[PDB]
Design a protein around this ligand. Sequence first.
Ligand code: HEM
Ligand SMILES: NCCc1c[nH]cn1
Length: 184
Amino acid sequence: KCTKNALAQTGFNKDKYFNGDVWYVTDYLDLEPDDVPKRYCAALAAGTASGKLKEALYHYDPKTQDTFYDVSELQEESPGKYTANFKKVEKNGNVKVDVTSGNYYTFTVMYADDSSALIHTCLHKGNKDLGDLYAVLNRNKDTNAGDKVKGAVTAASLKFSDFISTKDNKCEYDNVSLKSLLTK
Ligand code: HEM
Ligand SMILES: NCCc1c[nH]cn1
């Protein structure tokens, strides 16, 4: 089950956030981790296309090399708070799983600047919650969390010590497809 009391950034700048660029998940805190251990890689590209906010998502498992993509049309609930109805797609946009009613995620930009961000996500799949997930994002995949996003982690009453770094997971990203999926 997820918390809805996540606080959106005061004076959050949509323009720089939703610029069509890629954000890398450099650290994360899964509050409801799966039973089986999984090395994780994820990146996303939030922008706009044909009049809408769009977000394209990428997950990768270094170990199995399994990869999946999702692209969603975003609905602003409030500045900094968005609901996303996703569809799983091939890297060229061919739909593998259509948009469906109990399938969607919500996120709250808790902190953001030109280079970094702290988001909270709540994944809902099949009318069921997959639990809270907080992620530290960076425009550069090799950059360590700075003092500002860390103060933001503390400010949300979390411990950065409890966050898992993806820096050593031998991650690989497909930025080209991420960006082109933005219009699919
Ligand atoms: C950066 C923000 C992220 C967002 C918005 C996000 C969103 C999602 C979405 C939409 C799905 C559904 C895929 C589909 O079925 O079409 C998914 C699945 C999955 N994600 Fe993420 N994710 C993020 C970060 C990550 C990270 C860092 C991890 C590692 C904890 C993670 C692990 C997984 C796993 C294990 C699945 C399969 C779900 C299941 O267990 O059924 N994701 N994610
Ligand atoms: N507890 C895992 C939920 C999740 C995975 N990806 C995004 N959210």
